[PDB]
Protein backbone atom coordinates (compact mmCIF):
# COMPACT_ATOMS: atom_id res chain seq x y z
CA UNK A 1 0.00 0.00 0.00
CA UNK A 2 2.83 2.41 0.82
CA UNK A 3 4.55 1.71 -2.50
CA UNK A 4 1.29 2.14 -4.43
CA UNK A 5 0.58 5.46 -2.70
CA UNK A 6 4.13 6.64 -3.38
CA UNK A 7 3.80 5.73 -7.07
CA UNK A 8 0.43 7.47 -7.33
CA UNK A 9 1.74 10.62 -5.65
CA UNK A 10 4.86 10.68 -7.83
CA UNK A 11 3.07 10.13 -11.14
CA UNK A 12 0.23 12.57 -10.32
CA UNK A 13 -1.73 13.27 -13.52
CA UNK A 14 1.13 13.12 -16.03
CA UNK A 15 -0.48 13.05 -19.47
CA UNK A 16 1.27 10.74 -21.94
CA UNK A 17 1.97 12.26 -25.36
CA UNK A 18 2.48 9.80 -28.20
CA UNK A 19 4.04 12.38 -30.55
CA UNK A 20 6.17 15.48 -30.46
CA UNK A 21 6.75 18.17 -33.07
CA UNK A 22 6.99 16.56 -36.50
CA UNK A 23 10.43 16.61 -38.10
CA UNK A 24 9.09 17.76 -41.45
CA UNK A 25 9.74 21.50 -41.34
CA UNK A 26 9.04 22.60 -44.91
CA UNK A 27 5.34 23.47 -44.99
CA UNK A 28 5.45 25.39 -48.30
CA UNK A 29 5.98 24.25 -51.88
CA UNK A 30 9.23 24.45 -53.83
CA UNK A 31 9.23 27.38 -56.24
CA UNK A 32 10.10 25.80 -59.59
CA UNK A 33 9.36 29.02 -61.49
CA UNK A 34 12.15 30.47 -63.60
CA UNK A 35 13.64 33.96 -63.42
CA UNK A 36 14.76 35.75 -66.58
CA UNK A 37 16.25 39.11 -67.53
CA UNK A 38 13.02 39.84 -69.43
CA UNK A 39 10.98 39.88 -66.22
CA UNK A 40 9.49 43.14 -64.97
CA UNK A 41 10.01 42.05 -61.35
CA UNK A 42 11.52 39.14 -59.40
CA UNK A 43 7.95 38.01 -58.62
CA UNK A 44 6.25 38.61 -61.99
CA UNK A 45 7.06 38.00 -65.67
CA UNK A 46 4.88 40.48 -67.58
CA UNK A 47 2.00 42.87 -66.89
CA UNK A 48 -0.19 41.44 -69.61
CA UNK A 49 -3.70 42.86 -69.34
CA UNK A 50 -2.69 46.10 -67.62
CA UNK A 51 -3.93 49.13 -69.55
CA UNK A 52 -2.47 52.58 -68.96
CA UNK A 53 -5.39 54.96 -69.26
CA UNK B 1 -2.64 0.69 35.59
CA UNK B 2 -1.51 4.24 36.39
CA UNK B 3 1.10 4.16 33.62
CA UNK B 4 -1.42 2.77 31.11
CA UNK B 5 -3.95 5.47 32.00
CA UNK B 6 -1.27 8.15 31.72
CA UNK B 7 -0.23 6.86 28.28
CA UNK B 8 -3.85 6.71 27.10
CA UNK B 9 -4.56 10.24 28.33
CA UNK B 10 -1.38 11.61 26.75
CA UNK B 11 -1.85 9.96 23.35
CA UNK B 12 -5.59 10.77 23.17
CA UNK B 13 -6.79 10.13 19.60
CA UNK B 14 -3.66 11.15 17.71
CA UNK B 15 -4.16 9.99 14.12
CA UNK B 16 -1.01 8.61 12.51
CA UNK B 17 -0.25 9.95 9.03
CA UNK B 18 2.00 7.80 6.86
CA UNK B 19 2.75 10.58 4.35
CA UNK B 20 3.15 14.33 4.18
CA UNK B 21 3.07 16.70 1.23
CA UNK B 22 4.85 15.10 -1.71
CA UNK B 23 8.16 16.67 -2.67
CA UNK B 24 7.32 16.71 -6.37
CA UNK B 25 6.16 20.28 -6.89
CA UNK B 26 5.94 20.57 -10.68
CA UNK B 27 2.40 19.51 -11.57
CA UNK B 28 2.44 20.92 -15.13
CA UNK B 29 4.30 19.86 -18.26
CA UNK B 30 7.47 21.44 -19.62
CA UNK B 31 6.73 23.76 -22.53
CA UNK B 32 9.02 22.50 -25.29
CA UNK B 33 7.40 24.76 -27.90
CA UNK B 34 9.65 27.19 -29.74
CA UNK B 35 9.30 30.96 -30.01
CA UNK B 36 10.23 32.77 -33.22
CA UNK B 37 10.21 36.32 -34.55
CA UNK B 38 7.59 35.21 -37.08
CA UNK B 39 5.03 34.55 -34.34
CA UNK B 40 1.97 36.77 -34.05
CA UNK B 41 2.01 36.41 -30.25
CA UNK B 42 4.14 34.80 -27.52
CA UNK B 43 1.41 32.16 -27.16
CA UNK B 44 0.51 31.54 -30.83
CA UNK B 45 2.39 31.06 -34.11
CA UNK B 46 -0.13 31.98 -36.82
CA UNK B 47 -3.85 32.72 -37.14
CA UNK B 48 -4.41 30.16 -39.85
CA UNK B 49 -8.12 29.71 -40.48
CA UNK B 50 -9.15 33.17 -39.29
CA UNK B 51 -11.11 35.03 -41.97
CA UNK B 52 -11.57 38.79 -41.84
CA UNK B 53 -15.07 39.40 -43.10
mmCIF file of N, CA and C in Angstrom, chain B:
data_model
loop_
_atom_site.group_PDB
_atom_site.id
_atom_site.type_symbol
_atom_site.label_atom_id
_atom_site.label_comp_id
_atom_site.label_asym_id
_atom_site.label_seq_id
_atom_site.Cartn_x
_atom_site.Cartn_y
_atom_site.Cartn_z
ATOM 1 N N UNK B 1 -1.385 0.045 35.971
ATOM 2 C CA UNK B 1 -2.637 0.690 35.590
ATOM 3 C C UNK B 1 -2.469 2.201 35.487
ATOM 4 N N UNK B 2 -1.745 2.798 36.436
ATOM 5 C CA UNK B 2 -1.511 4.238 36.387
ATOM 6 C C UNK B 2 -0.725 4.632 35.146
ATOM 7 N N UNK B 3 0.312 3.861 34.811
ATOM 8 C CA UNK B 3 1.099 4.156 33.617
ATOM 9 C C UNK B 3 0.268 4.000 32.350
ATOM 10 N N UNK B 4 -0.573 2.967 32.291
ATOM 11 C CA UNK B 4 -1.416 2.767 31.114
ATOM 12 C C UNK B 4 -2.407 3.913 30.962
ATOM 13 N N UNK B 5 -3.025 4.342 32.064
ATOM 14 C CA UNK B 5 -3.953 5.467 31.995
ATOM 15 C C UNK B 5 -3.242 6.750 31.591
ATOM 16 N N UNK B 6 -2.031 6.972 32.108
ATOM 17 C CA UNK B 6 -1.269 8.153 31.715
ATOM 18 C C UNK B 6 -0.948 8.131 30.227
ATOM 19 N N UNK B 7 -0.530 6.974 29.708
ATOM 20 C CA UNK B 7 -0.230 6.864 28.284
ATOM 21 C C UNK B 7 -1.475 7.097 27.437
ATOM 22 N N UNK B 8 -2.607 6.522 27.847
ATOM 23 C CA UNK B 8 -3.848 6.707 27.099
ATOM 24 C C UNK B 8 -4.286 8.164 27.102
ATOM 25 N N UNK B 9 -4.169 8.837 28.249
ATOM 26 C CA UNK B 9 -4.562 10.239 28.326
ATOM 27 C C UNK B 9 -3.619 11.133 27.536
ATOM 28 N N UNK B 10 -2.332 10.788 27.485
ATOM 29 C CA UNK B 10 -1.382 11.614 26.750
ATOM 30 C C UNK B 10 -1.534 11.435 25.246
ATOM 31 N N UNK B 11 -1.748 10.201 24.786
ATOM 32 C CA UNK B 11 -1.854 9.957 23.352
ATOM 33 C C UNK B 11 -3.194 10.398 22.782
ATOM 34 N N UNK B 12 -4.256 10.363 23.590
ATOM 35 C CA UNK B 12 -5.592 10.767 23.168
ATOM 36 C C UNK B 12 -6.043 9.996 21.934
ATOM 37 N N UNK B 13 -6.374 10.716 20.866
ATOM 38 C CA UNK B 13 -6.795 10.131 19.601
ATOM 39 C C UNK B 13 -5.910 10.621 18.462
ATOM 40 N N UNK B 14 -4.599 10.640 18.693
ATOM 41 C CA UNK B 14 -3.657 11.151 17.706
ATOM 42 C C UNK B 14 -3.620 10.261 16.470
ATOM 43 N N UNK B 15 -4.192 10.742 15.370
ATOM 44 C CA UNK B 15 -4.158 9.991 14.124
ATOM 45 C C UNK B 15 -2.740 9.961 13.570
ATOM 46 N N UNK B 16 -2.335 8.799 13.069
ATOM 47 C CA UNK B 16 -1.006 8.611 12.506
ATOM 48 C C UNK B 16 -1.080 8.769 10.995
ATOM 49 N N UNK B 17 -0.318 9.714 10.460
ATOM 50 C CA UNK B 17 -0.248 9.954 9.027
ATOM 51 C C UNK B 17 1.020 9.319 8.475
ATOM 52 N N UNK B 18 0.861 8.461 7.471
ATOM 53 C CA UNK B 18 2.005 7.801 6.859
ATOM 54 C C UNK B 18 2.776 8.716 5.918
ATOM 55 N N UNK B 19 2.125 9.713 5.331
ATOM 56 C CA UNK B 19 2.753 10.580 4.347
ATOM 57 C C UNK B 19 2.521 12.041 4.704
ATOM 58 N N UNK B 20 3.365 12.898 4.144
ATOM 59 C CA UNK B 20 3.148 14.326 4.181
ATOM 60 C C UNK B 20 2.979 14.848 2.772
ATOM 61 N N UNK B 21 3.128 16.154 2.575
ATOM 62 C CA UNK B 21 3.071 16.703 1.229
ATOM 63 C C UNK B 21 4.192 16.119 0.384
ATOM 64 N N UNK B 22 3.855 15.685 -0.825
ATOM 65 C CA UNK B 22 4.851 15.100 -1.712
ATOM 66 C C UNK B 22 5.856 16.158 -2.151
ATOM 67 N N UNK B 23 7.113 15.738 -2.303
ATOM 68 C CA UNK B 23 8.164 16.669 -2.674
ATOM 69 C C UNK B 23 8.158 17.067 -4.131
ATOM 70 N N UNK B 24 7.444 16.327 -4.975
ATOM 71 C CA UNK B 24 7.324 16.705 -6.369
ATOM 72 C C UNK B 24 6.390 17.883 -6.535
ATOM 73 N N UNK B 25 6.948 19.048 -6.842
ATOM 74 C CA UNK B 25 6.162 20.277 -6.891
ATOM 75 C C UNK B 25 5.581 20.512 -8.277
ATOM 76 N N UNK B 26 6.387 20.309 -9.316
ATOM 77 C CA UNK B 26 5.940 20.566 -10.680
ATOM 78 C C UNK B 26 4.783 19.652 -11.051
ATOM 79 N N UNK B 27 3.598 20.243 -11.190
ATOM 80 C CA UNK B 27 2.400 19.511 -11.572
ATOM 81 C C UNK B 27 2.025 19.719 -13.030
ATOM 82 N N UNK B 28 2.697 20.629 -13.725
ATOM 83 C CA UNK B 28 2.440 20.922 -15.126
ATOM 84 C C UNK B 28 3.402 20.128 -16.004
ATOM 85 N N UNK B 29 3.395 20.456 -17.290
ATOM 86 C CA UNK B 29 4.302 19.863 -18.259
ATOM 87 C C UNK B 29 5.250 20.924 -18.798
ATOM 88 N N UNK B 30 6.488 20.513 -19.064
ATOM 89 C CA UNK B 30 7.469 21.437 -19.615
ATOM 90 C C UNK B 30 7.040 21.887 -21.004
ATOM 91 N N UNK B 31 7.145 23.187 -21.254
ATOM 92 C CA UNK B 31 6.734 23.761 -22.532
ATOM 93 C C UNK B 31 7.920 23.707 -23.485
ATOM 94 N N UNK B 32 7.947 22.684 -24.332
ATOM 95 C CA UNK B 32 9.022 22.496 -25.295
ATOM 96 C C UNK B 32 8.808 23.290 -26.575
ATOM 97 N N UNK B 33 7.701 24.019 -26.684
ATOM 98 C CA UNK B 33 7.400 24.762 -27.896
ATOM 99 C C UNK B 33 8.409 25.885 -28.110
ATOM 100 N N UNK B 34 8.710 26.149 -29.376
ATOM 101 C CA UNK B 34 9.653 27.190 -29.737
ATOM 102 C C UNK B 34 8.961 28.547 -29.805
ATOM 103 N N UNK B 35 9.775 29.598 -29.818
ATOM 104 C CA UNK B 35 9.302 30.960 -30.009
ATOM 105 C C UNK B 35 10.170 31.617 -31.067
ATOM 106 N N UNK B 36 9.535 32.235 -32.056
ATOM 107 C CA UNK B 36 10.227 32.766 -33.219
ATOM 108 C C UNK B 36 9.732 34.172 -33.509
ATOM 109 N N UNK B 37 10.582 34.961 -34.171
ATOM 110 C CA UNK B 37 10.213 36.321 -34.548
ATOM 111 C C UNK B 37 9.020 36.356 -35.498
ATOM 112 N N UNK B 38 8.721 35.252 -36.163
ATOM 113 C CA UNK B 38 7.588 35.210 -37.082
ATOM 114 C C UNK B 38 6.248 35.084 -36.364
ATOM 115 N N UNK B 39 6.266 34.768 -35.075
ATOM 116 C CA UNK B 39 5.028 34.548 -34.341
ATOM 117 C C UNK B 39 4.203 35.825 -34.258
ATOM 118 N N UNK B 40 2.879 35.651 -34.249
ATOM 119 C CA UNK B 40 1.970 36.775 -34.048
ATOM 120 C C UNK B 40 1.781 37.109 -32.578
ATOM 121 N N UNK B 41 2.184 36.217 -31.679
ATOM 122 C CA UNK B 41 2.012 36.411 -30.246
ATOM 123 C C UNK B 41 2.941 35.449 -29.526
ATOM 124 N N UNK B 42 3.316 35.747 -28.280
ATOM 125 C CA UNK B 42 4.145 34.797 -27.523
ATOM 126 C C UNK B 42 3.462 33.467 -27.260
ATOM 127 N N UNK B 43 2.148 33.391 -27.451
ATOM 128 C CA UNK B 43 1.409 32.157 -27.164
ATOM 129 C C UNK B 43 0.927 31.437 -28.420
ATOM 130 N N UNK B 44 0.986 32.116 -29.567
ATOM 131 C CA UNK B 44 0.507 31.539 -30.826
ATOM 132 C C UNK B 44 1.435 31.817 -31.999
ATOM 133 N N UNK B 45 1.558 30.871 -32.921
ATOM 134 C CA UNK B 45 2.390 31.065 -34.111
ATOM 135 C C UNK B 45 1.705 31.808 -35.261
ATOM 136 N N UNK B 46 0.598 31.288 -35.772
ATOM 137 C CA UNK B 46 -0.134 31.979 -36.825
ATOM 138 C C UNK B 46 -1.597 32.062 -36.417
ATOM 139 N N UNK B 47 -2.393 32.737 -37.241
ATOM 140 C CA UNK B 47 -3.850 32.720 -37.137
ATOM 141 C C UNK B 47 -4.352 32.144 -38.456
ATOM 142 N N UNK B 48 -4.377 30.815 -38.544
ATOM 143 C CA UNK B 48 -4.412 30.160 -39.850
ATOM 144 C C UNK B 48 -5.786 30.278 -40.500
ATOM 145 N N UNK B 49 -6.807 29.709 -39.873
ATOM 146 C CA UNK B 49 -8.122 29.709 -40.476
ATOM 147 C C UNK B 49 -8.940 30.960 -40.266
ATOM 148 N N UNK B 50 -8.400 31.956 -39.562
ATOM 149 C CA UNK B 50 -9.154 33.173 -39.288
ATOM 150 C C UNK B 50 -9.433 33.899 -40.593
ATOM 151 N N UNK B 51 -10.683 34.312 -40.777
ATOM 152 C CA UNK B 51 -11.111 35.025 -41.971
ATOM 153 C C UNK B 51 -11.649 36.392 -41.571
ATOM 154 N N UNK B 52 -11.117 37.450 -42.165
ATOM 155 C CA UNK B 52 -11.571 38.789 -41.836
ATOM 156 C C UNK B 52 -12.704 39.123 -42.765
ATOM 157 N N UNK B 53 -13.925 39.159 -42.249
ATOM 158 C CA UNK B 53 -15.073 39.403 -43.103
ATOM 159 C C UNK B 53 -15.131 38.345 -44.198
#
